[PDB]
Amino acid sequence: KVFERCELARTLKRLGMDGYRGISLANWMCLAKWESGYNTRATNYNAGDRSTDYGIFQINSRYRCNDGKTPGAVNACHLSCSALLQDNIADAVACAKRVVRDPQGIRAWVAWRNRCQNRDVRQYVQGCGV
């Protein structure tokens, strides 16, 4: 599913993401926007290390979810990567929460450093009533 912006913001709010480990809903929305365009079917294959990033948060198969085909992998979310391509983002949100329990928090998504950190991210939740 490709979420509409405020649709996703409300969904993430209902799923307990606002302020999770200090992270505002707008920062989660910025992450989803840049990682996937709010698309739960997004995938990106990383030829350099044989891993794949999956779903709305682009969770990686070398470190976070299991897809079988990625060498030297650990499954920190204890999830099949297929669970991260669903329209129902509950499993994705559970994994994202697990990612940000690591010390780096949301900086675990390196691109979030580039696209979101130390910026005005209020536009991602403007008008959504969250």
JSON list of N, CA and C in Angstrom, two decimals, residues 32-37 39-63 65 67 69-70 81-82 84-85 109-111 115:
[
{"chain": "A", "resi": 32, "resn": "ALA", "atom": "N", "xyz": [10.00, 7.59, 6.97]},
{"chain": "A", "resi": 32, "resn": "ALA", "atom": "CA", "xyz": [9.21, 6.82, 6.02]},
{"chain": "A", "resi": 32, "resn": "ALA", "atom": "C", "xyz": [9.18, 7.50, 4.65]},
{"chain": "A", "resi": 33, "resn": "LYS", "atom": "N", "xyz": [9.06, 8.81, 4.61]},
{"chain": "A", "resi": 33, "resn": "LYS", "atom": "CA", "xyz": [8.99, 9.54, 3.38]},
{"chain": "A", "resi": 33, "resn": "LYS", "atom": "C", "xyz": [10.23, 9.26, 2.56]},
{"chain": "A", "resi": 34, "resn": "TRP", "atom": "N", "xyz": [11.40, 9.46, 3.16]},
{"chain": "A", "resi": 34, "resn": "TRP", "atom": "CA", "xyz": [12.62, 9.33, 2.40]},
{"chain": "A", "resi": 34, "resn": "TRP", "atom": "C", "xyz": [13.01, 7.91, 2.17]},
{"chain": "A", "resi": 35, "resn": "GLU", "atom": "N", "xyz": [12.77, 7.01, 3.08]},
{"chain": "A", "resi": 35, "resn": "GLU", "atom": "CA", "xyz": [13.13, 5.61, 2.91]},
{"chain": "A", "resi": 35, "resn": "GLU", "atom": "C", "xyz": [12.29, 4.96, 1.78]},
{"chain": "A", "resi": 36, "resn": "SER", "atom": "N", "xyz": [10.97, 5.16, 1.78]},
{"chain": "A", "resi": 36, "resn": "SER", "atom": "CA", "xyz": [10.11, 4.39, 0.90]},
{"chain": "A", "resi": 36, "resn": "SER", "atom": "C", "xyz": [9.10, 5.18, 0.16]},
{"chain": "A", "resi": 37, "resn": "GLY", "atom": "N", "xyz": [8.96, 6.48, 0.39]},
{"chain": "A", "resi": 37, "resn": "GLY", "atom": "CA", "xyz": [7.80, 7.16, -0.09]},
{"chain": "A", "resi": 37, "resn": "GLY", "atom": "C", "xyz": [6.47, 6.69, 0.45]},
{"chain": "A", "resi": 39, "resn": "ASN", "atom": "N", "xyz": [5.58, 3.66, 1.15]},
{"chain": "A", "resi": 39, "resn": "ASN", "atom": "CA", "xyz": [5.17, 2.49, 0.37]},
{"chain": "A", "resi": 39, "resn": "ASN", "atom": "C", "xyz": [5.60, 1.24, 1.07]},
{"chain": "A", "resi": 40, "resn": "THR", "atom": "N", "xyz": [4.63, 0.40, 1.50]},
{"chain": "A", "resi": 40, "resn": "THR", "atom": "CA", "xyz": [4.97, -0.79, 2.16]},
{"chain": "A", "resi": 40, "resn": "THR", "atom": "C", "xyz": [5.57, -1.89, 1.29]},
{"chain": "A", "resi": 41, "resn": "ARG", "atom": "N", "xyz": [5.43, -1.76, -0.01]},
{"chain": "A", "resi": 41, "resn": "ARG", "atom": "CA", "xyz": [5.99, -2.74, -0.95]},
{"chain": "A", "resi": 41, "resn": "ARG", "atom": "C", "xyz": [7.39, -2.39, -1.42]},
{"chain": "A", "resi": 42, "resn": "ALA", "atom": "N", "xyz": [7.93, -1.25, -0.97]},
{"chain": "A", "resi": 42, "resn": "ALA", "atom": "CA", "xyz": [9.24, -0.86, -1.44]},
{"chain": "A", "resi": 42, "resn": "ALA", "atom": "C", "xyz": [10.26, -1.89, -1.07]},
{"chain": "A", "resi": 43, "resn": "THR", "atom": "N", "xyz": [11.22, -2.12, -1.99]},
{"chain": "A", "resi": 43, "resn": "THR", "atom": "CA", "xyz": [12.38, -2.93, -1.73]},
{"chain": "A", "resi": 43, "resn": "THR", "atom": "C", "xyz": [13.58, -2.29, -2.48]},
{"chain": "A", "resi": 44, "resn": "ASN", "atom": "N", "xyz": [14.72, -2.43, -1.86]},
{"chain": "A", "resi": 44, "resn": "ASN", "atom": "CA", "xyz": [15.98, -2.01, -2.44]},
{"chain": "A", "resi": 44, "resn": "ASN", "atom": "C", "xyz": [17.02, -3.04, -2.18]},
{"chain": "A", "resi": 45, "resn": "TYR", "atom": "N", "xyz": [17.55, -3.60, -3.28]},
{"chain": "A", "resi": 45, "resn": "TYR", "atom": "CA", "xyz": [18.62, -4.60, -3.20]},
{"chain": "A", "resi": 45, "resn": "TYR", "atom": "C", "xyz": [19.98, -3.87, -3.22]},
{"chain": "A", "resi": 46, "resn": "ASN", "atom": "N", "xyz": [20.79, -4.24, -2.26]},
{"chain": "A", "resi": 46, "resn": "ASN", "atom": "CA", "xyz": [22.12, -3.70, -2.11]},
{"chain": "A", "resi": 46, "resn": "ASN", "atom": "C", "xyz": [23.14, -4.69, -2.69]},
{"chain": "A", "resi": 47, "resn": "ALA", "atom": "N", "xyz": [23.51, -4.51, -3.97]},
{"chain": "A", "resi": 47, "resn": "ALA", "atom": "CA", "xyz": [24.39, -5.49, -4.59]},
{"chain": "A", "resi": 47, "resn": "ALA", "atom": "C", "xyz": [25.69, -5.63, -3.87]},
{"chain": "A", "resi": 48, "resn": "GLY", "atom": "N", "xyz": [26.20, -4.56, -3.28]},
{"chain": "A", "resi": 48, "resn": "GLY", "atom": "CA", "xyz": [27.47, -4.61, -2.58]},
{"chain": "A", "resi": 48, "resn": "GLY", "atom": "C", "xyz": [27.59, -5.56, -1.42]},
{"chain": "A", "resi": 49, "resn": "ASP", "atom": "N", "xyz": [26.51, -5.82, -0.70]},
{"chain": "A", "resi": 49, "resn": "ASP", "atom": "CA", "xyz": [26.59, -6.72, 0.42]},
{"chain": "A", "resi": 49, "resn": "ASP", "atom": "C", "xyz": [25.52, -7.80, 0.41]},
{"chain": "A", "resi": 50, "resn": "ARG", "atom": "N", "xyz": [24.78, -7.91, -0.70]},
{"chain": "A", "resi": 50, "resn": "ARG", "atom": "CA", "xyz": [23.78, -8.95, -0.92]},
{"chain": "A", "resi": 50, "resn": "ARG", "atom": "C", "xyz": [22.53, -8.84, -0.03]},
{"chain": "A", "resi": 51, "resn": "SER", "atom": "N", "xyz": [22.35, -7.71, 0.61]},
{"chain": "A", "resi": 51, "resn": "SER", "atom": "CA", "xyz": [21.23, -7.52, 1.48]},
{"chain": "A", "resi": 51, "resn": "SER", "atom": "C", "xyz": [20.16, -6.77, 0.70]},
{"chain": "A", "resi": 52, "resn": "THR", "atom": "N", "xyz": [18.95, -6.77, 1.29]},
{"chain": "A", "resi": 52, "resn": "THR", "atom": "CA", "xyz": [17.78, -6.07, 0.78]},
{"chain": "A", "resi": 52, "resn": "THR", "atom": "C", "xyz": [17.10, -5.27, 1.90]},
{"chain": "A", "resi": 53, "resn": "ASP", "atom": "N", "xyz": [16.70, -4.07, 1.54]},
{"chain": "A", "resi": 53, "resn": "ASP", "atom": "CA", "xyz": [15.90, -3.25, 2.47]},
{"chain": "A", "resi": 53, "resn": "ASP", "atom": "C", "xyz": [14.43, -3.41, 2.13]},
{"chain": "A", "resi": 54, "resn": "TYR", "atom": "N", "xyz": [13.57, -3.58, 3.16]},
{"chain": "A", "resi": 54, "resn": "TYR", "atom": "CA", "xyz": [12.19, -3.97, 2.95]},
{"chain": "A", "resi": 54, "resn": "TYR", "atom": "C", "xyz": [11.21, -3.04, 3.62]},
{"chain": "A", "resi": 55, "resn": "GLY", "atom": "N", "xyz": [10.20, -2.62, 2.84]},
{"chain": "A", "resi": 55, "resn": "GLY", "atom": "CA", "xyz": [8.99, -1.98, 3.37]},
{"chain": "A", "resi": 55, "resn": "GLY", "atom": "C", "xyz": [9.09, -0.53, 3.62]},
{"chain": "A", "resi": 56, "resn": "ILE", "atom": "N", "xyz": [8.14, -0.05, 4.39]},
{"chain": "A", "resi": 56, "resn": "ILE", "atom": "CA", "xyz": [7.97, 1.36, 4.57]},
{"chain": "A", "resi": 56, "resn": "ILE", "atom": "C", "xyz": [9.14, 2.05, 5.28]},
{"chain": "A", "resi": 57, "resn": "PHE", "atom": "N", "xyz": [9.79, 1.29, 6.14]},
{"chain": "A", "resi": 57, "resn": "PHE", "atom": "CA", "xyz": [10.98, 1.81, 6.78]},
{"chain": "A", "resi": 57, "resn": "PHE", "atom": "C", "xyz": [12.29, 1.27, 6.22]},
{"chain": "A", "resi": 58, "resn": "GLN", "atom": "N", "xyz": [12.24, 0.45, 5.17]},
{"chain": "A", "resi": 58, "resn": "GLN", "atom": "CA", "xyz": [13.46, -0.05, 4.51]},
{"chain": "A", "resi": 58, "resn": "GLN", "atom": "C", "xyz": [14.35, -0.74, 5.51]},
{"chain": "A", "resi": 59, "resn": "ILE", "atom": "N", "xyz": [13.84, -1.72, 6.19]},
{"chain": "A", "resi": 59, "resn": "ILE", "atom": "CA", "xyz": [14.53, -2.50, 7.16]},
{"chain": "A", "resi": 59, "resn": "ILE", "atom": "C", "xyz": [15.38, -3.58, 6.46]},
{"chain": "A", "resi": 60, "resn": "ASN", "atom": "N", "xyz": [16.62, -3.65, 6.89]},
{"chain": "A", "resi": 60, "resn": "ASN", "atom": "CA", "xyz": [17.64, -4.41, 6.18]},
{"chain": "A", "resi": 60, "resn": "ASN", "atom": "C", "xyz": [17.79, -5.85, 6.60]},
{"chain": "A", "resi": 61, "resn": "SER", "atom": "N", "xyz": [17.94, -6.73, 5.60]},
{"chain": "A", "resi": 61, "resn": "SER", "atom": "CA", "xyz": [18.01, -8.18, 5.79]},
{"chain": "A", "resi": 61, "resn": "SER", "atom": "C", "xyz": [19.31, -8.76, 6.33]},
{"chain": "A", "resi": 62, "resn": "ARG", "atom": "N", "xyz": [20.35, -7.92, 6.40]},
{"chain": "A", "resi": 62, "resn": "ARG", "atom": "CA", "xyz": [21.65, -8.36, 6.95]},
{"chain": "A", "resi": 62, "resn": "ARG", "atom": "C", "xyz": [21.61, -8.30, 8.48]},
{"chain": "A", "resi": 63, "resn": "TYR", "atom": "N", "xyz": [20.76, -7.43, 9.04]},
{"chain": "A", "resi": 63, "resn": "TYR", "atom": "CA", "xyz": [20.84, -7.06, 10.45]},
{"chain": "A", "resi": 63, "resn": "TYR", "atom": "C", "xyz": [19.51, -7.19, 11.18]},
{"chain": "A", "resi": 65, "resn": "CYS", "atom": "N", "xyz": [15.90, -8.33, 9.66]},
{"chain": "A", "resi": 65, "resn": "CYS", "atom": "CA", "xyz": [14.84, -9.28, 9.33]},
{"chain": "A", "resi": 65, "resn": "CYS", "atom": "C", "xyz": [15.47, -10.40, 8.49]},
{"chain": "A", "resi": 67, "resn": "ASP", "atom": "N", "xyz": [15.51, -12.87, 5.28]},
{"chain": "A", "resi": 67, "resn": "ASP", "atom": "CA", "xyz": [15.03, -13.24, 3.97]},
{"chain": "A", "resi": 67, "resn": "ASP", "atom": "C", "xyz": [15.71, -14.50, 3.41]},
{"chain": "A", "resi": 69, "resn": "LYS", "atom": "N", "xyz": [18.28, -15.34, 1.91]},
{"chain": "A", "resi": 69, "resn": "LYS", "atom": "CA", "xyz": [19.30, -15.27, 0.85]},
{"chain": "A", "resi": 69, "resn": "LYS", "atom": "C", "xyz": [20.44, -14.32, 1.19]},
{"chain": "A", "resi": 70, "resn": "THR", "atom": "N", "xyz": [20.39, -13.66, 2.32]},
{"chain": "A", "resi": 70, "resn": "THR", "atom": "CA", "xyz": [21.41, -12.69, 2.67]},
{"chain": "A", "resi": 70, "resn": "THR", "atom": "C", "xyz": [22.47, -13.36, 3.49]},
{"chain": "A", "resi": 81, "resn": "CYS", "atom": "N", "xyz": [11.40, -11.06, 6.64]},
{"chain": "A", "resi": 81, "resn": "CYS", "atom": "CA", "xyz": [11.29, -9.85, 5.87]},
{"chain": "A", "resi": 81, "resn": "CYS", "atom": "C", "xyz": [9.95, -9.68, 5.11]},
{"chain": "A", "resi": 82, "resn": "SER", "atom": "N", "xyz": [9.34, -10.80, 4.74]},
{"chain": "A", "resi": 82, "resn": "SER", "atom": "CA", "xyz": [8.02, -10.77, 4.09]},
{"chain": "A", "resi": 82, "resn": "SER", "atom": "C", "xyz": [6.98, -10.07, 4.92]},
{"chain": "A", "resi": 84, "resn": "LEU", "atom": "N", "xyz": [7.35, -7.47, 6.44]},
{"chain": "A", "resi": 84, "resn": "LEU", "atom": "CA", "xyz": [7.57, -6.05, 6.24]},
{"chain": "A", "resi": 84, "resn": "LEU", "atom": "C", "xyz": [7.13, -5.54, 4.92]},
{"chain": "A", "resi": 85, "resn": "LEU", "atom": "N", "xyz": [6.45, -6.38, 4.10]},
{"chain": "A", "resi": 85, "resn": "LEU", "atom": "CA", "xyz": [5.92, -5.91, 2.83]},
{"chain": "A", "resi": 85, "resn": "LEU", "atom": "C", "xyz": [4.40, -5.92, 2.85]},
{"chain": "A", "resi": 109, "resn": "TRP", "atom": "N", "xyz": [19.21, 4.39, 10.89]},
{"chain": "A", "resi": 109, "resn": "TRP", "atom": "CA", "xyz": [18.96, 4.61, 9.50]},
{"chain": "A", "resi": 109, "resn": "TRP", "atom": "C", "xyz": [19.86, 5.75, 9.08]},
{"chain": "A", "resi": 110, "resn": "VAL", "atom": "N", "xyz": [20.91, 5.40, 8.38]},
{"chain": "A", "resi": 110, "resn": "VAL", "atom": "CA", "xyz": [21.94, 6.32, 8.07]},
{"chain": "A", "resi": 110, "resn": "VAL", "atom": "C", "xyz": [21.34, 7.42, 7.26]},
{"chain": "A", "resi": 111, "resn": "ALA", "atom": "N", "xyz": [20.48, 7.10, 6.32]},
{"chain": "A", "resi": 111, "resn": "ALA", "atom": "CA", "xyz": [19.88, 8.16, 5.55]},
{"chain": "A", "resi": 111, "resn": "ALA", "atom": "C", "xyz": [19.07, 9.19, 6.37]},
{"chain": "A", "resi": 115, "resn": "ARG", "atom": "N", "xyz": [18.70, 13.21, 5.79]},
{"chain": "A", "resi": 115, "resn": "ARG", "atom": "CA", "xyz": [17.41, 13.72, 5.30]},
{"chain": "A", "resi": 115, "resn": "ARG", "atom": "C", "xyz": [16.49, 14.37, 6.35]}
]
